[PDB]
Design a protein around this ligand. Structure first.
Ligand SMILES: *[C@@H]1O[C@H](CO)[C@@H](O[C@@H]2O[C@H](CO)[C@@H](O[C@@H]3O[C@H](CO[C@H]4O[C@H](CO)[C@@H](O)[C@H](O)[C@@H]4O)[C@@H](O)[C@H](O[C@H]4O[C@H](CO)[C@@H](O)[C@H](O)[C@@H]4O)[C@@H]3O)[C@H](O)[C@H]2NC(C)=O)[C@H](O)[C@H]1NC(C)=O
Ligand SMILES: O=C1N=C(CC(=O)N2CCC3(CC2)Oc2ccccc2O3)CC=C1Cl
Ligand SMILES: CCCCCCCCO[C@@H]1O[C@H](CO)[C@@H](O)[C@H](O)[C@H]1O
Ligand SMILES: CCCCCCCCO[C@@H]1O[C@H](CO)[C@@H](O)[C@H](O)[C@H]1O
Ligand SMILES: CCCCCCCCO[C@@H]1O[C@H](CO)[C@@H](O)[C@H](O)[C@H]1O
Ligand SMILES: CCCCCCCCO[C@@H]1O[C@H](CO)[C@@H](O)[C@H](O)[C@H]1O
Ligand SMILES: CCCCCCCCO[C@@H]1O[C@H](CO)[C@@H](O)[C@H](O)[C@H]1O
Ligand SMILES: *C(=O)CCCCCCCCCCCCCCC
Length: 326
């Protein structure tokens, strides 16, 4: 008796005192104090205020700077758009519901806000995967006579939308479901409930393997094989000081990317390990929602790492911000 079940929701609080209400109808202040809902709102405001300009400025400077519109950069524009789906489909909605203390848009808004928030983060995820595959193909040259062009870059972008739809869409048609999560102001995939009518179990396994394990293996193989290729080539040109400098910065950048991906990936595995073991107990409105809580920040630090630290974009954006000068 950990929570209160209802049609289209699961509140992580016991109704033995009769105070639980539908997360679609009334504030959930038994889950958390009003000021904690405010701090949830303040966190969404921070994400909006950092995440909109950075990701929008990424799209804007690409319009103003011809050098950025290369095919290898398409997937980074895709990342920028995905983060904007997170900012507007997710963070902005959640700022609004947060300040009511429940999901005021009803179950219909739940499927909508759950779709677009989930799609956004899933496109971002697979953009980091596709970018690693592309960099691996361009550097390690696994295919004999191959040249990466506009057509290949478009396939990569389309591929992320297919993978994101492969996660975000089934809950609208009967495999898993969208429900309010945590403090009941955002909607998402149901990992909290063994809903047999929508076969929640097999979807969690499908998510764990296809949308969690596979991304880690591809990112690690590709980038590891790339660092290996760059390090062997540098080893054969050791008197080229710039080749050595270029080798160090590629390695340093792969480490930053992979570490930043683990900062978002390991919390889910940490919580996962707390459900493989420690299966019996109940989970508060914060337990499985801690990884989701902190993964939202990827809408800010991913463009900082992949776009803002890109030597090209950085100078482009400085010129754009500075009305053309410097
Ligand atoms: C967590 O647990 C609580 C406690 O059980 C649930 O809240 C109760 O929900 C039931 C309905 O499911 C509520 O019952 C309905 O109350 C209506 C209003 O009652 C108030 O006003 C009357 C005077 O009209 C007072 O006497 C009473 O004390 C209340 O203050 C009634 O109009 C309803 O009557 C209709 O339905 C019943 C059958 O349930 C019939 O017998 C009647 O003839 C009539 O058709 C009904 O009684 C109850 O008031 C709620 N209690 C509280 C404390 O809120 C939550 O739903 C549950 N949470 C979740 C998420 O499930
Ligand atoms: O790679 C990633 N994939 C992500 C996709 C996603 O939203 N998640 C759904 C919940 C998920 C997988 C992760 O976490 C689980 C823990 C235990 C059992 C099943 C699980 O499914 C997010 C972030 C990264 Cl870094
Ligand atoms: C830098 C560390 C920040 C920690 C913030 C913890 C704030 C706790 O603050 C307390 O929380 C209670 C919760 O109901 C309130 O009722 C108390 O009035 C309040 O003082
Ligand atoms: C840009 C941010 C807009 C925030 C809009 C918050 C509106 C909150 O609305 C409030 O919700 C309460 C229920 O929790 C009602 O009881 C109040 O009457 C109502 O004013
Ligand atoms: C150190 C602070 C950790 C705070 C963890 C808070 C977990 C609350 O859960 C949160 O509820 C929100 C409302 O539905 C959701 O939109 C968020 O995705 C979810 O993480
Ligand atoms: C480094 C990887 C970048 C992308 C990380 C995506 C994390 C997505 O996080 C997911 O967001 C959904 C919608 O808010 C929630 O329903 C899920 O509970 C949550 O895990
Ligand atoms: C996804 C896999 C990421 C691969 C990161 C490789 C980091 C290797 O890092 C390198 O290791 C060398 C070991 O001799 C050290 O000598 C170098 O100083 C160091 O740059
Ligand atoms: C040229 O490259 C710079 C052009 C002039 C920009 C100077 C203004 C920058 C201010 C940005 C930070 C504002 C902080 C607001 C915080 C709420």
């Amino acid at each position: 008796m950990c929570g209160t079940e209802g049609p289209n929701f699961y509140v992580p609080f016991s109704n033995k005192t009769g105070v639980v209400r539908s997360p679609f109808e009334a504030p959930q202040y038994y889950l958390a104090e009003p000021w904690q809902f405010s701090m949830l709102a303040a966190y969404m405001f921070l994400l909006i205020m950092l995440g909109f300009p950075i990701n929008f400025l990424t799209l804007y400077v690409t319009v103003q700077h011809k050098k950025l519109r290369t095919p290898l950069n398409y997937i980074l524009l895709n990342l920028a758009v995905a983060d904007l789906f997170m900012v507007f489909g997710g963070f902005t909605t959640t700022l609004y519901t947060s300040l009511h203390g429940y999901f005021v848009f009803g179950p219909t808004g739940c499927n909508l806000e759950g779709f677009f928030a989930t799609l956004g983060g899933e496109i971002a995820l697979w953009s980091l995967v596709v970018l690693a595959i592309e960099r691996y193909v361009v550097v390690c040259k696994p295919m004999s006579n191959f040249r990466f062009g506009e057509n290949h870059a478009i396939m990569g972008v389309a591929f992320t939308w297919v993978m994101a739809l492969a996660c975000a869409a089934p809950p609208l048609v009967g495999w898993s479901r969208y429900i309010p999560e945590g403090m009941q102001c955002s909607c998402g995939i149901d990992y909290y409930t063994p809903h047999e009518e929508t076969n929640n179990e097999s979807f969690v396994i499908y998510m764990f393997v296809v949308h969690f394990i596979i991304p880690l293996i591809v990112i690690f193989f590709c980038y590891g094989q790339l660092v290996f290729t760059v390090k062997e080539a540098a080893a054969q040109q050791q008197e080229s000081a710039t080749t050595q400098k270029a080798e160090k910065e590629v390695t340093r950048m792969v480490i930053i990317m992979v570490i930043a991906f683990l900062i978002c990936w390991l919390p889910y595995a940490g919580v996962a390990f707390y459900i493989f073991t420690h299966q019996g107990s109940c989970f508060g409105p914060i337990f499985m929602t801690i990884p989701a809580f902190f993964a939202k920040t990827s809408a800010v630090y991913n463009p900082v790492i992949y776009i803002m630290m890109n030597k090209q974009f950085r100078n482009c954006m400085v010129t754009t911000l500075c009305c053309g000068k410097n």
